[PDB]
Amino acid sequence: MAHMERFQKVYEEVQEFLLGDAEKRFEMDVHRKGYLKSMMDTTCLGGKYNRGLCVVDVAEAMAKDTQMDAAAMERVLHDACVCGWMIEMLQAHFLVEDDIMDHSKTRRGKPCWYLHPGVTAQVAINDGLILLAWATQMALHYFADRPFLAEVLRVFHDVDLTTTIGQLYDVTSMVDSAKLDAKVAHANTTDYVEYTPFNHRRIVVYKTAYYTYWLPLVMGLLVSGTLEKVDKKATHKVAMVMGEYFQVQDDVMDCFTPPEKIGTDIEDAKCSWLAVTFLTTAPAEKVAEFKANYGSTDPAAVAVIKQLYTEQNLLARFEEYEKAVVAEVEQLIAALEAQNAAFAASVKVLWSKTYKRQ
C-alpha cells in the first residue's frame, strides 16, 4: 500500500473543499450538502483505487529519480493524489451513468446508485454529471499555480472523450453497424455481426485502456514534471497492451472464477473476449448453439454457454494469451528501462498489480 493512508486523507480534504465550495458559490443548504456527501462516498468509495494510486507510485518514482527536497516531494505526492481522485471521480462518473444505461442491479455488493431508494435515475443521471464537473474542479483549484494545469485539463478531457467513444462503440455493437440509424429501430437482441475480436479490441482500448492505464501514467509524469523524459510512443503501446490484457482477464474471470460478485456477462450478452474469440473460431454447429442460448437470464442457457466455452478450451487459451502478453509487456519494459529506469520500474510494478488477478 504505502500511499493508501495519504490518498484517503486527500479524499476527505477534497470532499470538504468540494462541498464547502458549493456552500460558498451556490447557496448550498445543510440537507442537500448532506445528500452530496453520501453521493460522493457511495459512488467514489468501495473500490481498490488502483488507478488513483498508480498516479502516486509513478509520481513518487520519478521525483525520487531527481534531487528533491522533502517540500517539493510532498507537493508532488499531494498533487498525485488529486490527479488520482480526478481519475477515480471520472470512473465513478462512468459507473453511475453506465449502470443507468444498462439497467444494472448491483455495484460492489450494493445496489447501483440509481437504485438507492431515495435517489432514482432522474437524480442519478445528474449526480453522474456533478462527479465529472467535480473532477475538473479539483484541477482548477489544486493546480491553480502549477505549470501543468493546461496539460492536465487537456489530457483528462481527451480521455473523457475517448471513454465516451469506447462507450459509443460498446452500446452500438448490438446490431450490424450498417443498419444503425437514429430514425429506425433494430431493438432488443444482437445479430453478432460486430462481435469480432478486432471490434472488441476497439471497444476495450477506448472504453477502458486510456482511463485505466494511460491516464494514470501521464498524470504521474505531469505532476512529477517528467513527461519529456519518456517516449510518448512507448507509453501509449504499454498502456494499450496492459489495458487490453486487463479487460480480457476481467472477461474470463466474470465467467470462470467462483470467486467466493456474481458474473453476469452471458445473460447481458456482453461483447466479451470470450464471446468474440468463440464466435470467430468455433465449429459451425457450436456457433448455432451459442446464438440460441446467449443473452438469456435463464440459468440453463447460461450453463450451456459456459459448457460451450469449456469444450473450446477457452481458459487454457487465455493462459496462452496471458503468456504471449507477458512476453510483450516484458519487452516493452526492457525497452523503457533503456530510456529511464525510474519509469520502467514503475511500469514493472503496475504490471505486477495487473498480472494474475486472483
Ligand X SMILES: O=P(O)(O)C(O)(C[n+]1cccc(F)c1)P(=O)(O)O
What is the torsional sign of CA 208, 210, 214, 220? Answer: negative
Prior bond to 259 cis, omega within 30? yes
Judged by beta carbon, residue 68 or residue 123, the one nearer its own copies is: 123
* Chosen residue from 168, 288, 303, 334 binding its own copies by CB under 8 A: 168
For 20: left if phi > 0, alpha if psi spans -120 to 50, otherwise beta; the answer is alpha
Judged by beta carbon, residue 202 or residue 353, the one nearer its own copies is: 202
- Bridge partners (DSSP) of residue 107 are 110
Q: Which helix (H) or strand (E) covers residue 107, if one does?
A: strand 106-107
Cell of 111: 445496489
Which distant-in-sequence residues (6+ apart) come within 8 Å of 241 by Cβ? 325, 328, 329, 332
98 annotated to a ligand binding site: yes
The CA distance from 266 to 274, in Å, is 9
Residue 36 lies near its own copies (rule: CB under 8 A): yes
DSSP code at position 268: H
Q: Minimum distance from CB of 154 to Na ion (Å)?
A: 8
Residue 322 lies near Mg ion (rule: CB under 5 A): no
| Footprint of Na ion on 142-161 (CB under 5 A) | 157, 160
Residue 130 lies near its own copies (rule: CB under 8 A): yes
Residue 45 lies near its own copies (rule: CB under 8 A): no
Could you please report the per-residue DSSP string of 48-110?
--HHHHHHHHHHHHHHTTS---HHHHHHHHHHHHHHHHHHHHHHHHHHHHHHHHTT--EETTE
CB 333 within 8 A of CB 56: no
CB nearest ligand X: which residue?
98
Residue 123 lies near its own copies (rule: CB under 8 A): yes
* Chosen residue from 55, 58, 90, 100 binding its own copies by CB under 8 A: 100
Among candidate residues 169, 97, 167, the one with its CA nearest the CA of residue 132: 97
65 annotated to a ligand binding site: no
Residue 16 lies near its own copies (rule: CB under 8 A): no
Residue 292 interacting partner from Na ion, its own copies, Mg ion, none (CB closer than 5 to 8 Å by kind): none
**What count of other Cβ atoms lies within 10 Å of the Cβ of residue 256?**
16
- Which of the stretches 36-44, 60-68, 230-238, 256-264 binds its own copies when contact is defined by CB under 8 A? 36-44
Cell of 139: 484541477
Which distant-in-sequence residues (6+ apart) come within 8 Å of 17 by Cβ? 141
* Chosen residue from 149, 287, 326, 335 binding its own copies by CB under 8 A: 149
181 annotated to a ligand binding site: no
127 annotated to a ligand binding site: no
| Footprint of Mg ion on 79-98 (CB under 5 A) | 98
Residue 357 lies near its own copies (rule: CB under 8 A): no
**What count of other Cβ atoms lies within 10 Å of the Cβ of residue 125?**
14
Q: Minimum distance from CB of 167 to ligand X (Å)?
A: 5
* Residues forming the site for its own copies (CB under 8 A): 22, 25-29, 31-32, 34-36, 38-39, 42, 97, 100-102, 116-119, 121-123, 125-127, 129-130, 132-134, 136-137, 140, 149-150, 153-154, 157-158, 160-162, 164-169, 171-172, 177-178, 180-186, 202, 206
Q: Which residues bind Na ion (CB under 5 A)?
A: 133, 136, 157, 160
Annotation: binding site for Ca(2+): 98, 102, 170, 250-251
